[PDB]
């Protein structure tokens with residue numbers, strides 16, 4: 001048994017994108033043309049050195065990498081790549097960007113520099129901030145590469161959580177005003193501020209559905225809602241996130257799949273007197289439940305025993321009823337009512 005994972009695809013493609021400032025609308029980013037979105041030049045703009053491009057995704061996916069591609073503009077000097085696990089609230093940064101290693105601590109924090117030690121470490125790289133390439137500049141943030149977990153992902157919850165997301169945001173804080181226009185720019189001269197802005201011509205986010213290792217394909221069940229995907233769950237899981245077992249399969253607790261075992265849901269046993277059940281840890285630890293083979297190696301509890309039956313596996317007769325010796329536990333007549341005197 002091993003984990004199953006649906007293919008990666010471009011989360012960008014069918015997402016909602018927005019820009020705090022814009023005048024080349026935002027869409028040009030996520031579409032596939034050579035067109036592009038472009039912020040208002042520092043010229044008639046004071047705080048237009050701080051913009052925010054935002055992508056909203058349907059559900060919550062696992063993001064493998066965010067790739068930005070700049071057009072008529074050099075990469076920015078200071079920006080923040082942020083995600084969201086809410087659908088637009090408690091943001092969190094993924095990585096920080098700065099030209100001067102000192103700028104990091106000055107603008108972000110003292111600790112924002114230590115190398116990656118723990119799967120959910122943030123960081124403040126420089127590399128992607130050297131104005132040098134001032135045209136078609138590409139940045140590739142890989143949320144997985146490096147991290148200690150990438151090795152044995154399956155057993156690294158921190159990473160798995162670090163990579164989830166609902167919204168992804170590009171927070172630009174300061175243009176990469178380099179060369180020697182500093183004085184002009186600082187002074188606010190319309191010969192330097194009219195050649196400084198932001199230009200994205202493509203935002204490509206590689207990610208995939210979340211299925212806890214119980215599915216290798218997830219499509220859209222409804223043609224009318226082409227972007228809401230649902231896992232084609234396996235391992236007897238259910239939920240379209242495969243986060244729960246299916247009716248009838250609760251002998252064991254639910255688990256995501258690891259490299260070692262599929263961890264598929266086991267079927268509880270109700271001697272043909274029930275349609276559903278639930279897992280009770282106490283019962284399992286107490287060894288008081290029959291599995292399919294009739295051994296007490298589980299924790300399944302039948303709900304609504306039918307046929308005047310009752311018990312963890314509906315193996316007994318409700319008090320007041322008696323078991324027909326001429327009948328087997330599965331008979332819909334196992335238990336007969338009290339006879340006349």
Ligand SMILES: *[C@@H]1O[C@H](CO)[C@@H](O[C@@H]2O[C@H](CO)[C@@H](O)[C@H](O)[C@H]2NC(C)=O)[C@H](O)[C@H]1NC(C)=O
Pocket residue numbers: 020021050051052171
């Ligand atoms: C740019 O995006 C940032 C998100 O990083 C926004 O910052 C938030 O601004 C609100 C103002 O109501 C504050 O309450 C939040 O605390 C800010 N987030 C932070 C840094 O904690 C900002 O509003 C956006 N501005 C632009 C460019 O439109």
Ligand SMILES: *[C@@H]1O[C@H](CO)[C@@H](O)[C@H](O)[C@H]1NC(C)=O
Pocket residue numbers: 151152155
């Ligand atoms: C994954 O983690 C398990 C338990 O922590 C460990 O036995 C296994 O060797 C790890 N995978 C590898 C080889 O990195």
